[PDB]
Each structure stands twice: as structure tokens, then as C-alpha cells.
Amino acid sequence: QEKRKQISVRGLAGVENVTELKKNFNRHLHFTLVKDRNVATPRDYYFALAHTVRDHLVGRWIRTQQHYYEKDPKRIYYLSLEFYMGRTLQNTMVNLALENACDEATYQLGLDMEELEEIEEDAGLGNGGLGRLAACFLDSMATLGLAAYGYGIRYEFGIFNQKICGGWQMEEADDWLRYGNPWEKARPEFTLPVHFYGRVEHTSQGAKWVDTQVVLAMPYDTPVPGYRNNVVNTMRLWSAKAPNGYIQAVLDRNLAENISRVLYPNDNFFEGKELRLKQEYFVVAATLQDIIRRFKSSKFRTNFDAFPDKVAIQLNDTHPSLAIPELMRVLVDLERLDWDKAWEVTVKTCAYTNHTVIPEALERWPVHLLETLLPRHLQIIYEINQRFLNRVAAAFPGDVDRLRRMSLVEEGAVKRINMAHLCIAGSHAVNGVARIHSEILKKTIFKDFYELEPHKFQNKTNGITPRRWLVLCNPGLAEIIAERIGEEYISDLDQLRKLLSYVDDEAFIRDVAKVKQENKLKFAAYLEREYKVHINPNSLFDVQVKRIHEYKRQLLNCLHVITLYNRIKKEPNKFVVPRTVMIGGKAAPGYHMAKMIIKLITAIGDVVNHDPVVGDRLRVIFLENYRVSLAEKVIPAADLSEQISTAGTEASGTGNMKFMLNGALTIGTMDGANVEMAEEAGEENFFIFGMRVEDVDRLDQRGYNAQEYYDRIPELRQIIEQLSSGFFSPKQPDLFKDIVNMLMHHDRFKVFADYEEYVKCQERVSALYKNPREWTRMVIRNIATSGKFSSDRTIAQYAREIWGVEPSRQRLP
Amino acid sequence: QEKRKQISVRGLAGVENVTELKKNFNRHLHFTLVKDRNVATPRDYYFALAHTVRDHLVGRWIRTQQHYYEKDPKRIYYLSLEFYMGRTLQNTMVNLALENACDEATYQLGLDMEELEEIEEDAGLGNGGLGRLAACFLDSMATLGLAAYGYGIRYEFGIFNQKICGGWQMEEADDWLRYGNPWEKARPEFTLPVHFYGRVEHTSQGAKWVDTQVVLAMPYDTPVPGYRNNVVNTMRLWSAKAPNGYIQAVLDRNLAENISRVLYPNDNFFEGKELRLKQEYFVVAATLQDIIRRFKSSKFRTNFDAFPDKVAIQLNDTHPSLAIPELMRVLVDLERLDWDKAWEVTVKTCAYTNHTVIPEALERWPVHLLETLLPRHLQIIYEINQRFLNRVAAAFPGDVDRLRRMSLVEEGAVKRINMAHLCIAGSHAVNGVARIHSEILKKTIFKDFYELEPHKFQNKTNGITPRRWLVLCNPGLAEIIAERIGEEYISDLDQLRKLLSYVDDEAFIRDVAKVKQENKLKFAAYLEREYKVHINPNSLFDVQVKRIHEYKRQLLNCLHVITLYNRIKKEPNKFVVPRTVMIGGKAAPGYHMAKMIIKLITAIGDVVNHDPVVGDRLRVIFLENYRVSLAEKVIPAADLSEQISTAGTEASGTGNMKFMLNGALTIGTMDGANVEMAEEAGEENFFIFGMRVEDVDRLDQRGYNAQEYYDRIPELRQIIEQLSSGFFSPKQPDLFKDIVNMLMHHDRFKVFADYEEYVKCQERVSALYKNPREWTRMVIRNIATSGKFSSDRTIAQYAREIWGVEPSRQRLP
Ligand SMILES: O=C(Nc1ccccc1Oc1ccc(C(=O)O)c(C(=O)O)c1)c1cccc([N+](=O)[O-])c1
Ligand SMILES: O=C(Nc1ccccc1Oc1ccc(C(=O)O)c(C(=O)O)c1)c1cccc([N+](=O)[O-])c1
């Protein structure tokens, strides 16, 4: 209780406010859960709490949207296939200032609130950084008093829950709606129809799309509370419904409604399934009909000229890129605008974001698929391309090749549509997600595009919200900072810069260190409790948490790990800094390497965490089912943050930023937004190692020879032999042959090339750790200059340099 | 408003009670529906009302079941595949005395309650009389203060909604849960597992069922309020859930969960699909594990001796007959009781009800199906049979044939299990549902069974509740009766007998007549409004409402109809009593004849309802989507009730009884409970016509020759020619050839044999109608002696002569 109380950033437990809280808990438990104290179980408790919390939202929810209705601002729609939202109870208490009132209320009903929060299922409706970016963005727009709407798909099943079994990942279905969702509000009365397949008939009206199948889109609105300002914005998520012999026909209703069943779990990868394209069409179609409909109930040919003064539609990737030929379909086919105005209108509405440089992320849809599913869409896509490509010609006379490279339409054995090209044609701004990435888009991936229309290209470096990613997750760090500098920082994270005045403050240095060590103890208790894993709490917590992929170089970390181990065994009496190396995250099913890698990590731990010589000097664990909620526990307990992808492959990162905020030192490469984080802090306050991008490119130019490295480095040679011969898998010596083969002969991500610098850099890290005082002063430097990586920042730039709306922190009544 | 007010049986609109009602409406609309008056739509209104109503249930719900928990009575479980429940809002207001308070409240919120009630989706979780019998029974047990539980399956889809198109039935899916159910309460915390397929391994513990698939049963409890006594009992309905490459495996979750998708729509007919057997196993397994579990948390080898003092399990047909070998499975396999005690226990727990004499209703399951799905069940079924059949032997030495006829196991090309035999072996009482039917079970269908164990065989004539089937549906008739004799009748329907004192009371005769004519006007307004059908309100309303089947003889009615028409055209100037002939009800998909019959009825109406000579003398309409809710409208407006099945095929009937209660005269045969209704009223107060059962049998003995009738009756010959030659279908002359063929050559139900007596009897009916005063005095006689056909009666007999519990009308606090 006693910390929770003392914590000023958690609110007031007002005497009548507590009185009302307890009252509404009992009232919900009686009328909602239909219970008494003798038969409620914890989970009814949770729901009693979560209904009462939500009651505090309602009136603000109604009036905020009433407000948009009356004033009619320009509206921002944020189209994504993913809102990596997490749990919502705390989040909402936080943004409503209710957490110490509800904390006091439930204590006084003889219930620990934190215990009840863990009952909540994450809304895991995303894969990794972009989907979570989307969730951070929702929050920041609310906090900025924007008339923003998030639009997506209500999945049955989010990202699978991960089980490690015999060292392997096992996918289980994430049935997150089993027990109900007290947060959502069904909106039956706003249901729309979505048309699949059919054909196109040209007549004297123009074109007409006929014989279609119909799936209904049913919307479920969810409140996005802003930070303490009495804004509550909406996430609108669509669910598939069948239209309105006998038995087999009812059973088959499944087939149309499987549209919303399940998030595809492929992160940083295009698998080109028609089920996925259907998901993407459904979201787009439904959203844009909602959006037109609004527009037609607001002010007032008068109408569509001004459609872009009134609507902004932000593309979270190419996933909702069909939004472009869809708006053209409506405008053109339904609304009867001439193609050229409708195109002025589209390009002025829509804007695109890139999250990936890697080629195998690109959405390239075979035309036959698009011709069958969405025959009209493909026609409009070809008239898009022709006219775009007549614009490339008129600007680059005779550059045939450029024609071919710019085209929306890719040639081959299977003709495909390059959805990123579609997005470039059809948008008024195209952005990347950190300065380095956005430069590379201009210099490489979309170089010819930049030459055409250089004014389209922008940067918007990512952020994370400091509500979720400090105030919720790390109330100790939040509190000690409010103690010095007050509370404004929470929605003005640049004020953190003020903590630089404390670098030499012995109380502050003591407190910081105290709070991390407190987080380390909790995290440790969680591991013992939930998963009966015993960790050393007086070790350096070395954390790499992120989805599993070759670009991210979990493997290079595993290299390091087997080095520490091998060094130790050489020189057993030598002192070394104690470490807990935590690697965590999911593999996309069917990503073989990634699944290999998960097995290798736990294989390491099998050796390493049973050596008696090692003792408690070194421990390797794999962290299970990394998710949003788990990130809120492990990140506040981390000393070191791993950000080790090759230079040029991590567009930005945001877990980088979460570690930063919460008092973790970073080892990383100058990649993504690691580069801007070292800029903010001074490079002398980070662990940057290895190849810069230019050095990667130089390597590519002559050739990557991993054998060169193997022959030159006896320590690396030792591990490779360890792996081949079967040290990590005695009962199956050959188990890791496809790891080694790939390291040896087909490593696109240059692992061994950054080996020697990574190991030496990790020397540096542990040298610094042996001086507590000096570690904690560098950490202060870190935390004091993470304010640039708030999502308020990022969002205020999108508003001002894309949406053409001004932010705001003025409280609604 | 003004009738609703005056109506004493609807309660008090108390000043603070109205004040609280309005308050809780606004409160629900704000916190639940998240609305204001500017954007709620009617349907949010409904839900605001239905949440506030339900709040009045909760505390009674909790304490009633608390009461069972504390006192521990013997508990009655009522196992059915069907609860033909209907809508619930009004029903609950009624039984809670809240209808004139909520009526006043919503008027004063500027909303008509009746208008909001029509927003509610029927819970159509049944096919016709048995499923509805089940719903009437639930109510009566609550009203009698029994510790009764209804147990069934929560279907996704109830009985299809019926659309007539071009005169045909079109099945649409009944997506009754689209918008949510404010009535149910999910009970996640009572989920059970159900095991399909597998195998049986005999070891030293005995038998063990292994390699099974697991479907989870999730229970949804619903409150059954008793009439004004502060009992609220539970219906517990199970829903199928999947257990806890990647994508196709999540999608396939469907397959196990399709167990609860949909009510099979076959009424009075065995189609032997494995999907249906799975439904039946799921319900049984889940229910009985719930039931054992209770039993193990209540009092206290001690335990299972007394299992029958503590449990009664009533079989609504053979549909949950697997309850017998299931209890044996648990007891035997799980609980380790020796087979003989476990059999003492089973027979003492379980009791069976028959609803059908027809052969093609019987559940006869092929053994291979039962061997694959439910291999252990089949073993226990064969040890059941052997020992039963060793009992038949020891009682009937040398009667081989009897062995063979009694056996559970049927021989043939496909071996089958006779589930009714199973039920007879494994039950302590077997009942029929009206005196004639129960005699026939003894004299025919289960004659050898009766000889063995004559003390098993019983009668329990059906009833209907007078809440739904008078007070709700017919508040005018309810009120004029309370005016004379007070209100006790509502839960003591025998008091109706007191209205015989008014047979010669000119005010009463005037009132009765007034209320029917008021019901006729409403019904008429409903038809114009909802379906734009114009009926003559000064006609005799002649109503045949019931599922469509050959036994029920919709066809014999159609015969009559084309007679009236043909008579008229002969003699156009002749006076005839004006009639509106309403035929209504569903066909099971794939019942061809029944679908033919629906087309024939509307074909009749096409001719008949456009003849100018006919004018408003005669109108034929087919009533669409007959359902529970529709029955509550048309029955109070009916003058004549059609109950015309051959003698011996309608086991009982209950729609007979609903018409009776509400002031309809009956034409029928002496069949089912028509016979006991004529007994109660005096036959001189009914229209009984045609073959008695003995005369059917005599016909069978020599042979039914429909040609005999055709040659002898020029009027019948005229219609048959009309039908063949294409009068009823000019654009498709041959359309009704399969009707005629069947009438002519293969009529199992003897239509033409009851023709001449039916027509003459209908003469009688219209003679009586030309004397209003005399019609209304006979009706009084009818209504005054329908009290035997209350379900309180029926239920109090089950309690006393089967369950071995005493009813009660003592109010809970
Ligand atoms: O009623 C709400 N707000 C009100 C109140 C009065 C008029 C307009 C309101 O909100 C609205 C209503 C309609 C629209 C629309 O999409 O056409 C808009 C809009 O976004 O421009 C805002 C409301 C706000 C938030 C949640 C719910 N809800 O769950 O139903 C309802
Ligand atoms: O809590 C309820 N009643 C109470 C209160 C205290 C103890 C026992 C209660 O009800 C119960 C609880 C458990 C059981 C059981 O099945 O084991 C029984 C029983 O049927 O013998 C009655 C209750 C009654 C009706 C609805 C709900 N509900 O929806 O959860 C809850």
C-alpha cells in the first residue's frame, strides 16, 4: 500500500471519491456480475473494478464526440491493420487520475488492485513496433486534443500466446474475448456492407461493380482517454458478419466472418494469402464509407472540393493502401466526380508511412488475385499507373528504365502490384520513422520517386508515450522525477533536460539507483512466482526484447553469451561482473531460423545455467510470451538494452526509447533512432559499436566472406565448433547445422563482421558497471535527454507537417 | 395508455417506484448504452428498459439459489434439447408486478413500451409443442417454488426465420444474439470439458476412455421468475468452445464449436446426422457433471446411495437419453460403484417422457456411429440390454419373439440402438402427455414394456402457463375475469369454474365479446402495419397455427376452403357467414410435402382473395414466420381453433389449450388432449367431428381406399379436378401433382375419410356464429373450464408422482 499512497503522480484518494468507488464496485458486483462476496472469484473482482473505472470515462466520451459533432474540426483518421493496445484498466485510471483513489477503495474492500489488473487479457492486436506505434499514437492524439479516430479490425485472435516447450515455441490462439471486453461498445447501429469478388460492367452512367458477395462490418468503439485533459477519442474496430442444405448453409457463415478471425503473425514479412488481402479490403472499405458518411453529415459540388480540408487519412504502411483506389471508386463510381478532381481530392487526403527498407517486407499483390477479388480496384490501379507513368515520362524524356522501375505494375512470371508505389502516387506526403531511414528512402528505395516529387518526402521519427512507458510501468522513477521537477514533464517530456542539473546530486544518484534495484526485485519476484525462474538480483540485467528475426541479431548476442561462458571456463578464478542475460520475443510461425534461434537460446541456458564453475556469475534465460504487458515489467528492471541490428535494417526502433526512458544504458549500432538517441544524450553516454551503414555497403561491394572472420578469430572459431559438434545439443549433435550453415555461407546480416567490436564494447559496459556511481550518473544523462522520444513530439509534427491541424493541451470541461 | 392503466392485473404505478424506474432507465442509457436522447435509437431504448427490468430480478436470483445452497432440497433437473422461451421483457415485468410502473415510467420518458417490446428477438430455441412445453414447465416450477433447473444448449441459431417468397418458404438464419442478450449471464467460472471419439482400454482399475477430443462447455444462466412469489430459478444453456498451419488451425476452431451453432429444424422427425448426436452428448455430459458436482458440494459410500433422494433428471424425449449410459460411465468408471448399485441409482434418478406415437419420430442411432463417437457409451448400452433382456427372459420363459421386440438393439442391414427402449430400461417412470396417448403407449407402442413393468407407466397431460398464455398475451380477458372473480386464478386456474355463474350475465356476455372484438382489431392492425395484409374485422377468425405436417391435416382445412369458395360461386346471392381463414407455421427444410402445402395455401389465397363475386365473404391468408411471439398475437384474436389431426397422431397438443383459454371455440377430432378439453367443457360446448381412433384402425384393417371417397363425393371430386388441372396454378398446371398423388394413392393420414363430417361440422360452427349471444355463452363455457390445462397442474403431478417433491405457493422474502 505504502509506496502506492506516497506516489503523488497517482492522484488523490479523496474521502468521498473513495466512498463513491467502493459503492460503485459493490453495485457492479451486485447488478453486473450478479454476485456476492462469498461467490465472486478474482475475475469478477476485476470486472467490478473495470466497470466502475469505465463509468468515469462515459460522459467525457459522449461529450468529446459531441464536441467533434458540433464544432466540426478537420478529422484525422489513423488506418492501421494493428493497434498493439495491451491491457486498458490502469491506463485509464492513470489518464483519469483515479489510481490512488481505486487503490484506496479496493484495499478498503479487502482486495489488492494490482492482483486484479493481472487478470486482464492484453488486447494483443499487433505484431511488434508499427502496431504498438499505432497504440502510442492513439494516446498522443487524445492528449493533444486532436479530432482523431483510430480505425482497424476487431480480431477474434490477436498474436498467438507463446509457450516454450522442451525449449521450443508452441503457438496457442489468443482468445482475448473468452470472458468478455468491458472496454468496447458495440455499435450495431453503424453497421456497413463490404463487397468481395463480382465483376465490372461499363454503361452510360460509367462503371458499375456487380454480382458481389457481401460481408457486413460491424464497428466496436473503444475510448482513448487523453492525459488528464477530459478528451476521450475513439478506436473503431470492425468485425465481420454474415449477411441476413439448410444446416450447412448456416455453418458456412464462418467463411465470410473468418475475415476478422485472426491477426496474421508475420512481422517484417509479405506472405501473399488472399485471406490477408480480404482483411485489408474490409478495413479500408468500411472505414472510408464511415468517413464519407461523416463528411456528408457535418457542414454545408460544394461538398467534395473541400473533402481534404475536412479529412486526413493516415496509412500505417501499405497494409490499408487499397484506401487509394477505393476513394477513387466511391468518388468516381458512386459520387460521379470527374477522375481528375477525384485525384486531386485523393492525393490531398491520403498520406503514407514506411517502417521497413527490407525487400521482403514489400506488399506485392499478384494481379490475378486482385482481378478476381477486386476487379474494379485493379482497373483504377491500372489508370492510376498509366497516368502516373505518363507523368514520369513527361519529366524524364526518354528514361525508359526509370518508367519500368517507377511502375505500380511489376513484371515477371506473376504480374504484381507494388503497393508502396501505389501509396507514393496516391499520397501528398510519404514519411520514414527516423532520420537515417528517411534519408535512405530518399537515397535508395524510393530514389526515383524523390526525384519526381521531392516535396512529398518527410521524416517523422518515432516516439513512445511517457504515460504507458513511464507513469504506468515505472511509478518509482516517475515519482522521483516529479519530486524534483514537478509533473508537467508527463505531457511535456522535453522538461526531462532539467534533470541534467542533478548529475552530481548525491540524493538523486542514490534514488535512481534505488528505484532500478526496486524494479529488479519485483521483476525477479514475478519470474519466481509466475514461471518459477530464479534470477540473481545483484547482477547486471542485460535485456534483448523484440520479435525474433535475423536482422535484429539475437544470434550476435548468443555469440557474446557463449564468449562470456567460454572465458570463464578458461580463467575460472577471474573476477567478472555477474550477468542475467534475458532474450525475449516471438517468432512468426514458419520462420524456421527464428524458431531455430529460440531453441539455441534455451539450449545455451541448458549448459550455462547448470555449470557449477559458473555459478551465479552468468545466467541465460529466455523470456516467454513477450508481450505489451511483459514489456511493462522487464523494461523498468533493465540495466542494459540491446539494439544490435546491422546498420541500415531497423528503420527506427521504439523499444530502444522505452529502455532509455526507464534508466537503461544502451549498447547498439548507429541504426534507426539509436543514432538520434546517441545524438541526444552525447555518444559518450552510449555503447555504440560495429559497422556503420557505409561500412556495410563497402562490405557488400567487395563481398561478405564469413570464413575470413572464422579464420581470423580463434574465439569465434571456438563457438562455431561448439555449435557444430554438438556441445549445445548432445543428444542431437547436428541440431544447429542450419544456424552454422547460415552464419558460414548465407548471412545477409553480417553477424561475424560485428563480433569483435561487440565483445570489446560489452567489456566497456561491464567496466562501467563495476563503478555504480558512474553508471548511475550516465543513466541520469540518458533519462534526462529522452524527451525527444515522446510520441507527443512525433504526433505534433504529423499534425503540423502532414494533417494540417494544430495540436492542443487545453482541458475540455 | 388508458386501458393499460385501468388494467388492475398489471400492477401499481407507485410514485417513487416510477421515479426510480425513469432514473434507472436514464442511468442505463448513460452508462450502458453510452447515449443521450439525441442519439439513442429505439433499440437502445429497449436495452435501457431491459437492463432496468433485469435489475429488479438480481437480488431475488442470487438469494433463491443461495436458498437452494443452504437448505439443500432435492433438485429437479429438466433436460431438454429445447426451451421454446420467446421474448422475456414483459414476461418478467408480469411475474415481477412491474408492467404498469414501467408502462407509466416510459410514457413519462416519452416512449411507448409496447413499441420497445417489439424490438426484442424471440429466444426461438425450439421447434413446436415439446420445446414450448419445456418453456411452460420452467415457469411453473418457479411459481411452485421448486428447486428446479432447466438444462440445455445455447444455440447461435434457433429455428430459422421463415419468409414467404412467391408463395414459398425461404429459411433465414435466426441470429438472435446479433445485438447481445441482456437476459443471460455468462458463467465462465463453471466451464466443463466434454470428450468425443477416442477408445476404451480395460485395465485393473476397470475401464478407461482415452485419446479423446475435448470440447468445452461454457454455461449461460438465465433467470426464470415465478409468478409474483420472489422465486427466480435458472436455465443453464451450454455453448461449445474450442480447448486452449498456424492460421488454419485457429480457423478450424469452428468445427468443435459448431456444436452449439444451430437448432436442427425437424419437428415430429429423426434424421440421423452425427452433428445432432454431438449436441445431444454435449448437453448430457456437461449437465450431469454439473449435477454430480453439486451433489458433491451439498450435505455429508454415504454419498451415492442417496443420489436419487437428492437428484431428479427429467428426459424431454429421447433426445438426452445418453444421460442413462453417461451416469453409468461416471458412476461405474469414475466413481467406482459396482454396476448393480450404479443401476439402482440410475433407474431411481431418471424418468422419460414421450411426445410421439409416429415411428419416424423414433431415435434409432446406428451402432457404428455410436461406436466411433462414443465407444464406451455403446459398451454400457450393450450391458444395459443384456441384463434387461435377461430380465425379459426370466419373466417370459421361451417368448423369444418378445426378446427381439423388447431389445435396445435393432437388427437389420444397419444395426441401431432404440433410444426409447434405452429410456424404458433405464427409468423409474415413463409418461405420455395426454390420457389417450398414454393409454396407447400402454396398449401398443410400448405394450411389452408395460407387461414387464406396468408400475413404470404414467400419464401427465400437458398444460400451458396462464401468465404467458393469458395475463401477458390477453390483458383484456385477464382483466374482465379479475373484475368478477379476483386474481387468484392466475396461479390457481381451476378457479375459472367460477365464471360458469356468469353464463347468463348480460355484462359478462357483453365484455367477453368486447375483448375478443378488441383483440381482432389489434391483430388486424398488426397485419396491415407489419405485413400490409388487409383483413375483414367483422368476419369469423378461423385459425390453424402449428408446424406444417401431413398428420396435422392443413390439407383437410384447404379442402374446406376450396369448398366454401366453390359453394359461393355456385350460389353467389346466398348469405354466408364471412370468414378469415389464417393458416400458419413452419416446414422443416427438406420436408417436400409440407413445403408443397405451404405453396398450396398461398395458391388458394391467390384465387380466392381476388374473386370479385367473393368479395369480403371469404379470405385466405398464410401467416408468416409463425413463432412464440406471433402466437401471443393471433390466439387472443381467434374465434375458431383448428385441431384436425387424424385420431391417434397428436399425442396431446397445447396450442389447443392456448385457444381454449383465450375464448376460441374448437373444431377438432377426439385426439390428444382435445378429448379431455371436450370432457372439461361438455362435448356440447365443442365441435368434435370425424373418425375416432377405433374407426381409423377399422379402416386400416380393411384398407384405406381414397378412390372410394372421390367416386362418392362430387364436391371433393370437384376440388381434386381443380388441383390437377391447374386452377390453383395456371402458369404451371401440373404444380400440385404430388399433392393429388399423395391424397389419391398414399395418404397415411386419411384426409378424404374425414372430409364430409368436417364440412358439415363447419356448417354447424357458422350457424352458431350467426347467433352472437349464443356463441359468446358457449365461449364462456369454454374459458370457464380450461383450468385443467394450466401447467401448474401438470407440474404439481410430475413433482408428486415422479420427482418426489411437494410443490408450493409460499412467497420467498
Ligand atoms: O453520442 C455520442 N456523442 C454525440 C452526442 C451528440 C451528437 C453527436 C455525438 O457524437 C457523434 C455522433 C455522430 C458522429 C458521426 O460519426 O456521424 C460524430 C462524429 O464523429 O462527427 C459524433 C457518443 C460518443 C461516444 C460514444 C458513444 N457511443 O458509444 O455510442 C456516443
Ligand atoms: O450466488 C448466487 N447464489 C448463491 C449465494 C451463495 C451461495 C450459493 C449460491 O448459489 C449457489 C451456488 C453454488 C451452487 C452450486 O451449483 O454448486 C448452488 C446450487 O445450485 O446448489 C447455488 C447466484 C445466484 C444466481 C445467479 C448467480 N450468478 O449469475 O452468478 C449467482
Side-chain angles (χ1 to χ4, degrees), chain A residues 472-750:
Chain A
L472 299 210
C473 67
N474 211 351
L477 177 57
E479 188 60 6
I480 65 181
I481 292 173
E483 288 172 9
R484 303 308 194 105
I485 68 176
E487 275 185 9
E488 290 189 353
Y489 72 92
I490 308 170
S491 64
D492 187 11
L493 205 56
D494 287 325
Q495 289 202 24
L496 280 181
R497 279 201 168 257
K498 293 189 185 176
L499 303 181
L500 279 163
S501 307
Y502 297 103
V503 284
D504 296 311
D505 187 277
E506 301 304 337
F508 206 60
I509 293 171
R510 182 204 67 210
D511 293 342
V512 172
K514 179 189 87 89
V515 159
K516 179 60 58 176
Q517 187 52 27
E518 283 169 353
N519 294 351
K520 296 177 57 175
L521 292 170
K522 195 159 190 174
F523 189 63
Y526 168 89
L527 261 182
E528 186 64 45
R529 178 173 78 252
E530 304 306 316
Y531 302 94
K532 304 266 151 238
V533 169
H534 173 258
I535 68 180
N536 175 7
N538 303 110
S539 61
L540 186 171
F541 280 16
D542 180 355
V543 189
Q544 197 183 190
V545 297
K546 55 192 58 256
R547 284 293 293 257
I548 316 288
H549 194 291
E550 290 160 280
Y551 94 76
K552 290 174 176 294
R553 306 203 284 185
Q554 282 101 180
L555 283 169
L556 168 65
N557 198 172
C558 283
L559 304 182
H560 179 236
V561 178
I562 306 164
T563 309
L564 295 190
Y565 173 80
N566 289 344
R567 280 181 172 205
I568 287 167
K569 293 312 295 290
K570 284 166 192 200
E571 298 189 274
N573 305 328
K574 176 183 182 166
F575 178 79
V576 295
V577 175
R579 285 195 187 210
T580 298
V581 186
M582 307 189 212
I583 319 175
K586 290 162 178 181
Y591 197 3
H592 183 242
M593 202 48 74
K595 277 203 145 154
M596 293 319 301
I597 290 163
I598 299 167
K599 179 69 177 150
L600 182 57
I601 294 160
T602 62
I604 302 169
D606 301 328
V607 172
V608 173
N609 302 346
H610 307 104
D611 212 334
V613 172
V614 167
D616 63 330
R617 307 157 77 196
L618 180 59
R619 198 143 218 187
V620 194
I621 68 172
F622 183 87
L623 311 171
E624 184 175 296
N625 207 29
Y626 180 66
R627 61 197 174 281
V628 171
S629 65
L630 186 51
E632 301 182 26
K633 300 183 180 77
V634 66
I635 297 175
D639 297 320
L640 189 65
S641 184
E642 295 270 1
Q643 317 295 333
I644 70 173
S645 61
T646 316
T649 55
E650 200 72 279
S652 160
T654 54
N656 55 3
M657 305 185 197
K658 299 162 196 174
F659 278 94
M660 203 190 177
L661 187 52
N662 277 289
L665 293 187
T666 299
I667 194 171
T669 61
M670 292 292 296
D671 197 27
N674 296 1
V675 177
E676 290 161 73
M677 297 165 55
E679 191 184 25
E680 292 291 303
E683 283 177 44
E684 77 278 3
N685 300 299
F686 266 64
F687 298 100
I688 312 300
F689 73 92
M691 294 188 283
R692 284 41 174 186
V693 162
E694 63 186 274
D695 303 312
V696 170
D697 300 331
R698 275 186 251 149
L699 247 180
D700 286 326
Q701 286 154 31
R702 62 164 190 270
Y704 185 54
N705 190 10
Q707 192 69 43
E708 184 183 294
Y709 301 89
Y710 184 87
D711 288 339
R712 298 184 184 176
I713 307 156
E715 278 182 314
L716 166 59
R717 198 155 64 236
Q718 192 189 359
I719 295 158
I720 306 313
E721 299 309 331
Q722 287 172 309
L723 295 166
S724 306
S725 73
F727 185 75
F728 293 106
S729 50
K731 301 189 148 182
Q732 183 185 350
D734 79 304
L735 181 59
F736 305 119
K737 77 168 165 288
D738 298 354
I739 301 200
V740 181
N741 184 57
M742 184 280 296
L743 292 182
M744 300 303 293
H745 313 288
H746 307 112
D747 192 6
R748 289 165 78 196
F749 288 111
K750 307 173 175 62

Side-chain angles (χ1 to χ4, degrees), chain B residues 235-300:
Chain B
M235 195 178 55
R236 175 164 305 196
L237 298 180
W238 305 104
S239 149
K241 292 308 178 281
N244 14 50
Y246 169 74
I247 297 278
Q248 194 51 262
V250 164
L251 299 192
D252 280 353
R253 279 175 68 98
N254 299 320
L255 302 181
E257 284 196 5
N258 289 340
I259 292 174
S260 57
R261 209 63 75 192
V262 59
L263 168 80
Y264 265 100
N266 295 337
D267 177 65
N268 292 87
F269 200 79
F270 175 67
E271 175 172 64
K273 307 294 135 95
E274 193 183 61
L275 175 52
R276 182 64 187 196
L277 186 58
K278 294 175 167 176
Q279 304 196 325
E280 289 191 5
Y281 190 54
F282 179 82
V283 194
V284 154
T287 298
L288 268 68
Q289 274 194 74
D290 219 33
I291 280 183
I292 300 267
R293 175 199 39 82
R294 281 221 188 68
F295 172 72
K296 287 176 181 204
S297 326
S298 61
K299 194 216 277 150
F300 322 113

Side-chain angles (χ1 to χ4, degrees), chain B residues 473-530:
Chain B
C473 67
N474 211 351
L477 177 57
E479 188 60 6
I480 65 181
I481 292 173
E483 288 172 9
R484 303 308 194 105
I485 68 176
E487 275 185 9
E488 290 189 353
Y489 72 92
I490 308 170
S491 64
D492 187 11
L493 205 56
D494 287 325
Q495 289 202 24
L496 280 181
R497 279 201 168 257
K498 293 189 185 176
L499 303 181
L500 279 163
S501 307
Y502 297 103
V503 284
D504 296 311
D505 187 277
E506 301 304 337
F508 206 60
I509 293 171
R510 182 204 67 210
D511 293 342
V512 172
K514 179 189 87 89
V515 159
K516 179 60 58 176
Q517 187 52 27
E518 283 169 353
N519 294 351
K520 296 177 57 175
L521 292 170
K522 195 159 190 174
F523 189 63
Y526 168 89
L527 261 182
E528 186 64 45
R529 178 173 78 252
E530 304 306 316

Side-chain angles (χ1 to χ4, degrees), chain A residues 61-62 65-66 69 75 149 187 293-294, chain B residues 34 39:
Chain A
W61 200 12
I62 294 161
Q65 311 306 316
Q66 201 203 338
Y69 180 75
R75 286 166 207 234
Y149 302 88
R187 279 315 274 285
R293 175 199 39 82
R294 281 221 188 68
Chain B
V34 192
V39 280

Side-chain angles (χ1 to χ4, degrees), chain A residues 33-36 38-40 44, chain B residues 54 58 60-70 72 75 77 149 151 185-187 189-190 221 232 234 236 290 293-295 297-298:
Chain A
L33 306 196
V34 192
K35 295 265 206 158
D36 101 353
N38 203 62
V39 280
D44 286 305
Chain B
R54 175 230 212 236
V58 170
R60 290 158 171 149
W61 200 12
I62 294 161
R63 275 180 247 132
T64 300
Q65 311 306 316
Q66 201 203 338
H67 189 47
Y68 308 156
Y69 180 75
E70 248 129 74
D72 193 33
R75 286 166 207 234
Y77 309 106
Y149 302 88
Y151 268 95
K185 187 59 193 78
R187 279 315 274 285
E189 66 266 6
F190 272 112
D221 290 358
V232 190
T234 295
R236 175 164 305 196
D290 219 33
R293 175 199 39 82
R294 281 221 188 68
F295 172 72
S297 326
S298 61

Side-chain angles (χ1 to χ4, degrees), chain B residues 128 165 195 271 356 376 535 586 640-641 666 684 699 788:
Chain B
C165 184
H195 290 261
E271 175 172 64
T356 49
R376 192 60 187 153
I535 68 180
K586 290 162 178 181
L640 189 65
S641 184
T666 299
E684 77 278 3
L699 247 180
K788 170 176 174 177

